[PDB]
Design a protein around this ligand. Structure first.
Ligand code: ZN
Ligand code: ZN
Ligand code: ZN
Lengths: 144, 499, 156, 96, 83
């Protein structure tokens, strides 16, 4: 193996990466080895040959994030009485998850997003949280 | 107040003074406005909609009610516009009604409502709701109607449609189509109708088909127009293959005249929905083996590695009856031509006599005979019209060819509507297989998930294709349960584990 | 920002940022010269906030940094020069980008004040050192490295 | 305070944490699921970086930590012609 | 009964199954990602499939340009050989 631009199938490296970025945004357990290897997976996706899959990786990360805070939101308002404590639990998980996933997506942030209208994954995850869990719940959250 | 604030106050208080005078007369009575937005959008009052959008844009929680109620209005308008369609011209009327609703509600949004992105998203949501609208406990109608719309538009029409017609109607069809949330059924129907148009030459022009395939590619990626573009390229290279076959036969060591013609249509196996469904144990007729063996040799020596599985049911042939008196020229299908050769050596034929000649099963030989005798070319020699062992048929010598183009190909030339349910079943089975593979990959990747989270994941990776029904995903979970691949967790059935 | 996204270029390849940092921009003599003084820190900061391409080039490859570092009055107008360099580096500018003559902005800086201001604003990087070595040794970098590096050694 | 940057060959490259945190994807690699609250090895295992180029990366860590507040004729960093185009990638991956 | 004109269809598939050119992620029997855009200036017919000894199929452009800089089969990291 080497750092040269190689060809990677997106649906395999992204499938390996999704089980990690699902388990780091929820503050589940992913070991040091897997977390380190996901950095090489992100790099190999961002400099893939001959088409860099940075745009597809960012698109699917955004889609996963908007499919996660949507699930968290559906988990929030279903507990109407305790939406405050459920929101606090899910936000405490999701803030650290967004920070860790911004750490994981550093190459995509500093080599694709900053070159290109696009929000960095640390900014995107919070912006996905505001537009899908805070603003829909701003009537109930601030009231309680 | 904006003008007056410039005249007197410091610039730093240009905002607060106006903002504080918003949160007294547009936000203290916000609910009042929110109690009436409905009417403002139900009658489409342009001045009132513009004023209300300008008013509620500054208020933090004012706009979302207007967005939601505009979405509701557009959804109700779409339901009332695309549910009273006549069954005669339904494929055109559905697309035209959705098109005109989209045009009206983007002209209203772009000018009166300043074209806010949230309002366009509400329009998209409402049009997605009206396009994927189905009768109670019934399948969706958008994919079939839109595929039939493209099939009727791109076919050779007697209305004299110009190239600009298919250049503009299809371009607007892309806008209409992007709202189908069940795109796989449309993909398979367009593949089937494109195949039936390509094999029979029913298409208006190959340039129009290429433009349509490119438009669908731009709409939905390359995996959508993979099989379709491969079919189009096969039809584009069939002529070059026929020219290469002519060069091969004229460049042989011994000069050989084909006799019969050979306008071969080579097709890729994966791309084309045409499949060898029956046994099709039809022996090649003697007059065709000379070309068949030569084409097998050519395709084995010029393109090595491509096994050529013959489909002896889709091939046509210009047949003539020399014993009848050589009347004009007749076009039949190969699937029965062998029994016609039986009429060469016996004026009367029996099913036992035909069975050794055509070598195929009689379960379709009977219907080919029926499609031969309905034009009175071949008459019933015996009396037993039912399927019997003897079942004599004779050559009707009194009836000559009525027209120069004695076309029996019209049985296959027209695409029957009885195969629509078969295509639906094929789409359903392929959908089950694709969802099974995707959920196997998901279960082998994660191995820890909840049931509602499983549904969320299923729709997450089904975003790129059809959306899955909740009962359908439940049935998929059941069939995984009874396949020794997933099992109910001991703690609860909500948790699932992969072995 | 509309014009910035339009990306206008003069006959010499000067973008809006290059003119806003150039002291050779001809300011009109009637009344604008009494107020509009170029280079101006405020106009460049506003252009960068509006999304100006910081790593643009002239016809001879000079970026905004190459243009500003040749400024003629670094003592009396130290505030302007310092703010221009701070804004250019903060918005993202390769402080060793090479023009067509293979001159870094330090090599183009006439005054020592601008040299040392840039050196304070210059961050050492191994990517730049390796790209400089690749360019000096003329190693063939076509398809051997990512496209981002294929241009990173392009202007180093 | 001493991470252990493994190479693709297998060479442990124990370097001070202050030096190794000047990277982007080494400060990011030691942040999150891998933090080593026990601070026992701090492995930053690289299965893509060769050893002969990770040695030069560590030498760059030391060189940059040393010659940072100098601004007065810093000595050149001797990138060999052969290791270049392999150290450009190894510095792009680690963000210099 | 002799006939004068005949036309036929026939599905063809490779002896070993393969669908997509692994490099450009297009089909092997479709144009490569390069000359798909350059379909007018070029002939757009020389883009044939190139078969490695490892039973892997890529477009001739998509593997010829891959082999100009590196020396490895892309899918499985092994030496190639045009069979
Ligand atoms: Zn290719
Ligand atoms: Zn090509
Ligand atoms: Zn291979």
């Amino acid at each position: 193996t080497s750092l040269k631009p190689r060809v990677v199938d997106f649906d395999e490296t992204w499938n390996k990466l999704l089980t990690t970025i699902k388990a780091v945004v929820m503050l589940e357990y992913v070991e040091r080895a897997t977390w380190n290897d996901r950095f090489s997976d992100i790099y190999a996706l961002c400099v893939a040959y001959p088409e860099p899959l940075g745009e597809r990786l960012y698109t699917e990360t955004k889609i996963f994030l908007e499919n996660h805070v949507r699930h968290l939101h559906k988990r929030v308002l279903e507990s109407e009485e305790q939406v405050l404590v459920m929101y606090h639990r899910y936000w405490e998980e999701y803030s650290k998850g967004a920070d860790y996933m911004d750490c994981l997506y550093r190459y995509l942030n500093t080599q694709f997003i900053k070159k290109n209208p696009l929000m960095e994954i640390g900014e995107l995850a919070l912006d996905m949280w505001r537009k899908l869990m805070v603003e829909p719940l701003q009537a109930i959250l601030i009231r309680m | 107040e904006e003008i007056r604030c410039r005249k007197y106050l410091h610039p730093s208080s240009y905002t607060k003074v106006i903002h504080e005078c918003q949160q007294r007369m547009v936000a203290d009575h916000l609910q009042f406005l929110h109690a009436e937005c409905h009417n403002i959008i139900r009658q489409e009052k342009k001045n009132d909609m513009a004023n209300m959008y300008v008013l509620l844009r500054a208020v933090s929680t004012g706009l979302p009610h207007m967005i939601q109620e505009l979405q509701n209005h557009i959804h109700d308008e779409g339901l009332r516009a695309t549910s009273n369609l006549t069954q005669e011209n339904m494929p055109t009327l559905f697309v035209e009604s959705v098109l005109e609703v989209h045009g009206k509600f983007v002209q209203l949004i772009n000018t009166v409502l300043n074209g806010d992105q949230h309002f366009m998203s509400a329009l998209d949501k409402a049009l997605t709701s009206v396009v994927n609208y189905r009768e109670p406990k019934s399948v969706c109608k958008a994919p079939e109607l839109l595929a039939k719309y493209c099939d009727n538009l791109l076919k050779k029409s007697a209305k004299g449609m110009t190239e600009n017609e298919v250049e503009d109607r299809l371009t607007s069809f892309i806008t209409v189509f992007k709202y189908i949330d069940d795109k796989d059924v449309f993909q398979k129907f367009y593949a089937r109708m494109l195949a039936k148009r390509l094999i029979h030459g029913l298409s208006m022009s190959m340039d129009s088909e290429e433009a349509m395939i490119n438009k669908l590619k731009q709409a939905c990626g390359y995996e959508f127009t993979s099989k379709l573009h491969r079919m189009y390229t096969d039809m584009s290279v069939s002529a070059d293959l026929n020219n290469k076959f002519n060069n091969f036969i004229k460049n042989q060591d011994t000069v050989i005249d084909l006799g019969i013609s050979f306008q071969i249509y080579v097709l890729q196996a994966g791309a084309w929905p045409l499949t060898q469904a029956p046994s099709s144990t039809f022996a090649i007729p003697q007059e065709l083996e000379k070309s068949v063996q030569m084409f097998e040799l050519f395709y084995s020596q010029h393109f090595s590695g491509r096994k050529l599985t013959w489909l002896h049911y889709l091939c046509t042939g210009e047949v003539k009856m020399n014993y009848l008196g050589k009347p004009y020229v007749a076009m039949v299908t190969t699937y029965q031509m062998a029994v016609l050769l039986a009429f060469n050596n016996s004026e009367t034929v029996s099913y036992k006599e035909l069975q050794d000649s055509t070598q195929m099963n009689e379960k379709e030989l009977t219907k080919t005979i029926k499609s031969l005798l309905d034009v009175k070319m071949i008459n019933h020699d015996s009396e037993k019209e039912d399927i019997d062992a003897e079942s004599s048929f004779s050559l009707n010598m009194n009836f000559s060819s009525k027209r120069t183009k004695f076309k029996i190909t019209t049985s296959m030339q027209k695409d029957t509507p009885q195969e629509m349910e078969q295509t639906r079943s094929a789409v359903d089975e392929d959908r089950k297989m694709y969802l099974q593979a995707a959920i196997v990959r998901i279960m082998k990747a994660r191995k820890v998930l909840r049931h509602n989270a499983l549904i969320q994941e299923v729709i997450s990776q089904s975003r790129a294709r059809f959306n899955p029904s909740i009962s359908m995903i439940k049935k998929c979970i059941e069939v995984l349960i009874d396949k020794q691949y997933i099992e109910r967790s001991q703690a609860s059935a909500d948790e699932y584990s992969y072995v | 920002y509309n014009l910035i996204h339009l990306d206008p270029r003069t006959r010499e390849g000067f973008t809006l940022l290059h003119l806003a940092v150039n002291s050779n921009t001809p300011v009109d003599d009637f009344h604008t010269n009494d107020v509009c003084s170029f280079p101006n820190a405020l106009v460049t900061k506003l252009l960068l906030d509006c999304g100006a391409e910081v790593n643009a080039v002239d016809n001879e490859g000079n970026s905004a940094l190459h243009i500003i570092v040749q400024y003629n009055r670094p003592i009396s107008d130290f505030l302007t020069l310092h703010s221009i360099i701070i804004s250019l580096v903060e918005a993202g500018a390769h402080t060793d980008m090479t023009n067509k003559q293979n001159k870094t902005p330090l090599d183009k800086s006439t005054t020592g004040v601008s040299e040392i201001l840039l050196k304070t604003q210059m961050k050492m990087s191994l990517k730049c050192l390796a790209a400089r070595a690749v360019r000096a040794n003329d190693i063939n970098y076509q398809d051997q490295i990512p496209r981002t590096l294929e241009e990173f050694v392009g202007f180093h | 305070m001493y991470v252990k940057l493994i190479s693709s060959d297998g060479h442990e490259f124990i370097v001070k944490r202050e030096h190794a945190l000047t990277s982007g994807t080494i400060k990011a690699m030691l942040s999150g699921p891998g933090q080593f609250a026990e601070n026992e090895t701090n492995e930053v295992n690289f299965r893509e970086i060769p050893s002969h180029v990770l040695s030069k990366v560590c030498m760059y860590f030391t060189y940059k930590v040393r010659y940072t507040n100098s601004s007065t004729e810093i000595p050149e960093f001797p990138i060999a012609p052969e290791i270049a185009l392999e150290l450009l990638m190894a510095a792009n991956f680690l963000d210099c | 009964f002799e006939v004068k004109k005949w036309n036929a269809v026939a599905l063809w598939a490779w002896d070993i199954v393969v669908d997509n050119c692994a490099i450009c992620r297009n089909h092997i029997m479709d144009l490569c990602i390069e000359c798909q855009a350059n379909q007018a200036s070029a002939t757009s017919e020389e883009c044939t499939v190139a078969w490695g000894v490892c039973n892997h199929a890529f477009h001739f452009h998509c593997i010829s340009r891959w082999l100009k800089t590196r020396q490895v089969c892309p899918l499985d990291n092994r030496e190639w050989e045009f069979q």
